[PDB]
C-alpha cells in the first residue's frame, strides 16, 4: 500500500503544471490523456470509500 501510494503521488505531482499552460499546447493534453488512460475510473473513489 505504501508503494502504491508513493507511485500515485508521483504520478499526481507529475501533472503538467495547471490549466494555465494546458490550453495553449498539446503536449500537456497528451500527457493528461496518457495519465488518465493508465489508471481507470471508479478506483480512487472506491479506495476512499
Amino acid at each position: 500500500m505504501s508503494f502504491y501510494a508513493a507511485l500515485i503521488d508521483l504520478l499526481g505531482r507529475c501533472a503538467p503544471e495547471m490549466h494555465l499552460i494546458q490550453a495553449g499546447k498539446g503536449e500537456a493534453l497528451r500527457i493528461r490523456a496518457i495519465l488518465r488512460s493508465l489508471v481507470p475510473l471508479d478506483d480512487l473513489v472506491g479506495i476512499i470509500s
Binding site: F3, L10, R13, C14, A15, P16, E17, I31
Partner: protein, 49 residues
C-alpha cells in the same frame, strides 16, 4: 523497500518548489512507460490484473 525508496526519491526530484518542470516530467514519463516491466508489471495491471 527498494521500490518504496526509489519512489520516495523520485517524488522529491519533480515538484522542485511546488511547481512542475515539464521537461523532467515528460522525460520521466517516457522513461517509466518505455519499459512495460516497471512499477510491478505482474500486479499493477500490466500482466492482466
Amino acid at each position: 523497500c527498494g521500490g518504496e525508496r526509489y519512489l520516495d526519491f523520485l517524488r522529491f526530484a519533480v515538484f522542485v518548489n511546488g511547481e512542475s518542470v515539464e521537461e523532467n516530467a515528460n522525460v520521466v514519463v517516457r522513461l517509466l512507460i518505455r519499459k512495460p516491466e516497471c512499477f510491478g508489471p505482474a500486479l499493477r495491471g500490466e500482466g492482466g490484473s
